[PDB]
Symmetry: C3
Subunit: 560 residues, 3 copies
């Protein structure tokens, strides 16, 4: 099985070099196109780079103040700075108040609730008892009675008087909260690639303001500009708050030869503009300060509407990795065989006879493509599975050879039908040298009944031709090639120069060589010479020229 | 090197088309299986799609209130709404209080600390001085004395009296914080694919509540159902707080023909249930309000235990990309050669004689697989490296040819052993035409010593056979083929019809052609005809028939 | 086109098995190298694993207190615990105060601002009116007058007196905030792989402190160590706050046979150390408590500088996926043909005559590589596109055959130049058997003008040799092979043994067979035997031996 010489074996694929401009041109342009697409994808998607998602940290600083005068009994003149509207978070998100309601005497008692649009209840003692409403903050025993002038509400155990249920003002308060300035210091890192960077670099202008075209890299933003860049109106969002999103996209190429790693800023409204009224439309929150005055545990509650800005820092950093390039090249290497596949398809399609039957006469421009057929004769070598039932029979009348692959079921082989096969080119180089008692299944006269078992007798039942005429044995070459004793002796000497030469039982080898000679004569290819069935007239002629004394003649046997 | 015709060269692969049902069947079923697996992986993992992680923004709204009566000197009836237990964050995380302790007279002085289970210290002045305990909030000078009835503690500089060290109540306060409702508005975006969507869509029911089977898409959640869906008990988590996680998974397919992009909700307890007592088991925090009463800078501190719900939004959006499909197809194209590899392995395995020696007689079912061997004869063409030491020698007695690859170290070539090589099929188509003073290393009588340098004399030392007998020169074909002057003249005319024909020094070409004729006679293949070593008898017979007048006979020379 | 037998066809690639140690060695070592690199990349990058990013939840607990004495009119002694400096967030980020300024009587009035380094304004009424400064919290009408001793500031409507503009103390307050301890409980999950784990496991030491080498897996951290591990100074960061980042990297392998999933802790300063003074250098925030005293709505504001620690949890979990392994193997399978490509390149390079002209004589070590040329003769079979203009002509004088691919534009074919082609090896096995009125373009004497249309007359204008001499027709083999009637009759009988044999119009077949015989004689390969152009002398000799009675002689016709 395994030998030391077997290890050092190597197999080269046999090929034939076709000299043609069409095949070479389509080959080269297909190779160039697939190479161009591969390189384009490589340099566009940067598939040679291992990517990694960043890790981000954000620091927000909101600077700006707003004057606002309370509603006139007594009038107030107040100022709002970052200490009040801004929250202690100050990282990755920040709140900018744009409207506020306040209740000073918030304390626990059994007063009613504010009448909303639908909450206006005129019935007396109709409300549920111990309902624990999510709308009104207190658990209620109904006892509905009027505290307003022309309306009423249920008796609630919430913080009183008249805290919830009130709508926001219109126009919005704190309209000066649009020129406020946000400084966003963002620091991103790629730990696998080990590259840390940040938004602000040395030399950046401090007094800049972000704009889409003039100074995009400036990390200083104005809220009005944020809302105007996407067409949003700051006033309606100031009446009822919202949720904005500052997208910071990093597309970082950490390669030194093309190093670029900077952010791109975008803005997107996060809260649903057209949202249901039952759901909480805007972003709001209600917080209070607790205190004890006159012995009563009480508090003061303010509900603030404003815009929450989510700073969404995302991106990807790519760095050259050899393994990714290797995998991509290994994937794309298979496409270079597209040219060979297409050309082989062309050759196999134009080699068929259907192109000569229908295509070439009708089209009349694919006529020179018949050349492809010749390439098929140089590309393919059709063989057949040497089955035991495989047989080959020839007839002088017809030009082709019949492949009788079917099995014998007692019927005479002369009438069995098979697939025609064209005879080979005969290798013209090697060829260029100097009474009526028949079995009734032959058309000639020289046939003879076969002497074999009846189960296997139909194999020898073959004739030299399909219709009556001259027998092939009467030809001039049959006497000279098939059973010319000098010729067979010369052939055997060529195979074994020291043969017995009329010794003991030499006629068997001469008979076998005569069978092989007739086979190679009619069936040129050695694949077809084997598994050939000679006719009875020639078989028994050869047997007469080289009889067997003390034994029967064994017919065709499976060689392999 | 390079020519314009060399660019237009295309090389096809020579093949032989086997007609067999077994090979074709296994080829087609293997191709179908690999194609089916490739398509299955492509459609399941969606490898034709470029994926992208989402960017999310969450907005939480907790609605629900809870009545609770303080411990009875005086009794207090209180209500808790979203203003108190909920925090100002309101995005991506929210706290829901489920237990609380409070201390009103929190002020700075040198009073003792609360006695815990292990913190109970009965020693007198045994505690460390200036220890700065992390457990107790104050730095301690020991001075341990009793302030309780039957227990004592060290003197601490913490906010007093007796704030820390106290356990939580059991049962939990604010047990009504289980029917509380959470509205989670989640807006997600794929910026690379440029697709923004949100949890709540138009037409969704407002009064719905989340359930695993009935209404999963409802973003309204009940706190009790969240714990009950995973078997968690809300009471024990209400006594000592915890951390829950609302996982929102997006598996978005942005292709129009199969567009689906909606969330899936799941719940998972984040804090370790079985955790150490030394570590802080539950989620809690202690915050206060600062105030000045009677001139003393003081505060009131409350420690709240509750459940922190982390809304973990994650997922992936896939969109059709051509480069990913190209890479995947290029990767999977190599698997289509699996059928060819397997069939070639089958052919190369069943071609060896090992299968005929052991496998076929024993098994008796692999008998028809010997046909594969024939395919090997049509697939492979074994050749040998034409080394300078490569030689071929034949013997009329033995049927095979010996490959003497070994080098001559002075030993006679007649006894050198080599690897047997079977003679070819002889190309039957082209063949079907019409006293005792020996060197003592030969076995015939016609041998003669070689006239060459002693260093290179052993090459010609070869005989026509291994054992005594008739010499090959006495054969009938030797006189007709090898040195028949008419035959060699005809061959030379076939190569060059205008030869000198008995002119000056024609015997050299006749001698060379006679050597080639004997080689092709014994060593059929031209690869074996070259590098063949003739015996001394035939060599000197040919030299006698075609002598060299005024020069020595140059032996075998490396042609390449 | 399509047949049931055509489906079961399978094609094996023809190969020739080379027996050489060099080729086998380079093949095997190249295969081993590419296999080793593939396995190394697979086991290093874990490309057989599908990766997934984690989802994290962090819970922070800061323990530690700090004593601090206020500046001495009256002196104060106070303690700071986690209730005050820590924020209610307690998840994924926490604040640790390291400096504080405070203003008690913060209230709204028209007092001036604190004079900074540049804010010191000496002009009288020079400041802008209604400027709404971001620097000072109040909107200002100028009215600049002095309130300090030797300096002045504009009149501001901010919360007064002298809140903003003040620098931080140096040394920093709360220097005891360096031994503070942080417990970080991090729970991570891989939902696609469905694997949940956490930082703390059973059996971990509770009293441990994090160290790089001794106990890295301890999740308890000291704030001083976090700065000392990276060389940062805690005092300068305590004076003016900063931002730190605790990186928690997960490299989880969820395969059971190599299961390891634990965090790695690193620390990185997030805020820019060397940052502009105009920008806010350190991390700080100003918050207040609101109250009413003496009827005035007032507040007390404290500005805190401290370190914000961002717990950046990230990582990746890999789990065995068959599809990823299949894709990777399909990608890397193409590299196994690298050995075949390299060996074919070697064979095609060392097969050219360029290596024998320049390389082998000069180098003298690549001499035995000429053997590769022989492999080319066994690998490649160069053919030519059978164009209509393709022609072949031979001459007895010259040894090679001329390929006349050019078209006939009326010029005589005898003088047309073409590319030389070497004659084949002649298949020595098959060959080893037993007056002055010329056209003036030939050089022999037996030429004759051609009888064809003038447009196609130049095709037959060919001679048997390039220079004068003996005509090829006078050769001895011409009379025996080309026009020996017995030979042609035997050949035709071999093709069809039942020919008419001197019947009606048999001379046409004999003439065609004589043309084919001369072609196969001079042009051995059947590819070159076709498309051959015989000379006028031999052509008209053959026509004289086999005349045509009642018709003209049709010249060479395109067979395909
Ligand atoms: C926000 O800022 C803009 C720009 O400073 C204000 O628009 C100016 O308002 C002042 C008020 O006296 C006037 O000078 C002009 O009406 C505006 N100036 C310019 C150059 O247009 C705006 O009033 C501010 N407040 C908001 C929008 O609420
Ligand atoms: C943005 O919306 C605001 C209102 O929220 C618009 O300002 C109002 O315009 C109407 C027009 O009829 C006036 O009646 C109101 O008095 C205005 N109010 C305020 C506060 O300005 C404003 O015009 C809108 N801007 C754009 C660009 O559409
Ligand atoms: C939370 O809500 C549920 C459902 O409304 C309450 O369960 C009911 O409690 C009241 C108590 O008087 C009674 O109607 C029944 O005992 C319960 N009915 C049902 C259908 O469950 C629950 O008591 C509320 N409070 C909690 C859980 O603390
Ligand atoms: C933080 O803790 C360290 C270690 O406990 C303190 O360092 C010690 O300080 C005390 C001061 O009386 C003395 O024991 C030594 O000066 C120090 N000993 C060691 C071993 O370092 C430090 O003073 C504490 N406070 C800070 C850093 O502000
Ligand atoms: N292709 C072919 N080979 C045959 C045929 N007949 C016999 N052979 C071979 O010739 C041998 C049998 O010849 P035969 O003289 O009839 O019987 P034998 O005397 O017992 O050897 C066997 O080796 C067969 O393989 C035939 O008809 N066609
Ligand atoms: N295969 C083979 N070729 C041989 C042998 N001897 C000679 N040749 C060839 O014949 C030529 C030498 O023949 P020879 O008459 O002995 O010497 P020469 O007169 O100098 O040419 C050389 O071209 C050899 O290649 C042999 O024994 N075996
Ligand atoms: N290769 C080659 N084939 C030729 C040549 N001349 C004729 N043939 C073939 O021989 C046939 C024409 O021979 P010819 O006797 O001259 O004319 P015909 O009487 O009409 O057959 C055609 O089938 C040609 O293909 C030639 O010069 N070279
Ligand atoms: C005589 O030679 C005995 C029979 C030897 C048959 C050897 C069969 C080799 C089979 C190789 C199978 C390779 C499978 C590789 C899977 C990864
Ligand atoms: C003889 O060949 C007649 C049939 C001609 C039509 C078939 C030729 C096909 C050659 C091109 C095939 C590659 C293109 C595939 C299109 C996607
Ligand atoms: C007679 O033989 C009629 C002509 C038949 C020509 C058949 C051409 C087949 C073309 C196959 C093209 C395959 C394209 C596959 C693209 C995915
Ligand atoms: C028949 O089936 C063959 C069809 C192949 C046609 C291919 C045509 C493309 C090549 C154009 C001609 C050669 C151009 C040479 C200049 C580069
Ligand atoms: C005579 O022909 C001179 C010798 C010419 C030898 C040409 C050798 C070509 C080598 C090609 C190497 C290609 C390497 C590609 C690497 C990407
Ligand atoms: C003659 O061939 C005797 C040996 C027979 C055993 C070897 C045949 C192997 C054919 C199948 C190989 C592919 C299957 C590989 C299994 C993973
Ligand atoms: C010898 O060793 C060959 C072994 C290969 C056997 C393969 C058997 C599979 C094919 C089954 C027979 C053909 C079925 C035809 C109907 C589709
Ligand atoms: C005849 O062959 C003379 C030219 C010799 C030089 C070319 C030989 C090249 C063989 C190696 C090619 C593969 C190496 C590729 C380098 C990247
Ligand atoms: C000429 O062009 C051929 C050059 C190829 C040289 C390759 C040399 C590598 C093999 C070393 C020799 C064989 C070693 C055998 C022991 C394993
Ligand atoms: Zn008959
Ligand atoms: Zn007959
Ligand atoms: Zn001898
Ligand atoms: Zn001898
Ligand atoms: Zn002439
Ligand atoms: Zn001539």
């Amino acid at each position: 099985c395994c030998s030391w010489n077997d290890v050092f074996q190597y197999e080269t694929n046999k090929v034939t070099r076709i000299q043609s401009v069409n095949y070479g041109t389509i080959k080269w342009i297909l190779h160039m196109t697939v190479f161009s697409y591969v390189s384009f994808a490589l340099m566009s998607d940067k598939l040679y780079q291992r990517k990694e998602p960043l890790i981000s940290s954000v620091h927000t600083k909101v600077k700006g103040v707003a004057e606002v005068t309370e509603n006139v009994t007594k009038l107030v003149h107040g100022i709002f700075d970052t200490a009040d509207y801004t929250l202690p978070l100050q990282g990755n998100s920040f709140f900018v108040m744009t409207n506020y309601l306040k209740s000073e005497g918030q304390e626990q008692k059994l007063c009613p609730e504010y009448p909303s649009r639908g909450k206006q209840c005129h019935s007396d003692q109709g409300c549920i008892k111990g309902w624990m409403d999510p709308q009104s903050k207190g658990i209620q025993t109904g006892r509905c009675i009027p505290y307003d002038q022309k309306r009423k509400t249920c008796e609630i155990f919430a913080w009183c008087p008249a805290e919830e249920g009130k709508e926001a003002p219109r126009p919005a308060l704190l309209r000066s909260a649009e020129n406020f300035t946000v400084l966003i210091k963002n620091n991103i890192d790629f730990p696998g690639h080990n590259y840390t960077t940040r938004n602000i670099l040395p030399g950046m202008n401090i007094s800049c303001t972000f704009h889409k075209t003039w100074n995009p890299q400036c990390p200083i933003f104005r809220l009005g500009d944020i809302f105007q860049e996407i067409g949003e109106n700051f006033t309606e969002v100031a009446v009822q708050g919202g949720i904005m999103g500052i997208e910071i996209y990093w597309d970082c190429n950490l390669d030194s030869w093309s190093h670029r790693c900077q952010p791109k800023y975008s803005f997107r409204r996060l809260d649903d503009k057209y949202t249901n009224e039952s759901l909480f439309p805007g972003y709001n929150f209600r917080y209070a300060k607790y205190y004890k005055e006159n012995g009563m545990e009480k508090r003061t509650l303010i509900k603030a509407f404003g815009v929450r800005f989510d700073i969404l820092v995302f991106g990807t950093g790519g760095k050259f990795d050899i393994i990714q390039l290797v995998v991509y090249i290994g994937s794309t290497l298979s496409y270079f065989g597209l040219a060979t596949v297409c050309i082989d398809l062309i050759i196999n399609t134009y080699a068929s006879t259907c192109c000569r039957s229908r295509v070439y006469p009708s089209c009349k421009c694919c006529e020179p493509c018949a050349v492809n057929e010749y390439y098929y004769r140089k590309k393919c070598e059709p063989i057949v599975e040497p089955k035991p039932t495989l047989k080959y029979v020839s007839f002088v009348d017809e030009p082709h050879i019949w492949m009788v692959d079917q099995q014998l079921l007692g019927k005479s082989l002369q009438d069995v039908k098979g697939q025609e096969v064209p005879r080979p080119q005969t290798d013209f180089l090697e060829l260029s040298r100097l009474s009526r008692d028949s079995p009734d299944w032959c058309q000639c006269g020289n046939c003879l009944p076969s002497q074999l078992p009846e189960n296997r007798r139909a194999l020898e039942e073959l004739c030299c031709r399909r219709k009556p005429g001259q027998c092939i044995t009467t030809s001039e070459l049959f006497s000279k090639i098939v059973l010319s004793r000098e010729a067979l002796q010369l052939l055997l000497l060529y195979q074994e120069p020291l043969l017995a030469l009329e010794g003991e039982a030499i006629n068997s080898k001469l008979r076998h060589c005569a069978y092989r000679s007739y086979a190679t004569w009619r069936f040129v290819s050695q694949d077809m010479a084997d598994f050939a069935i000679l006719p009875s007239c020639c078989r028994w002629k050869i047997r007469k020229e080289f009889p067997k004394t003390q034994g029967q003649y064994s017919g065709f046997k499976y060689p392999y």
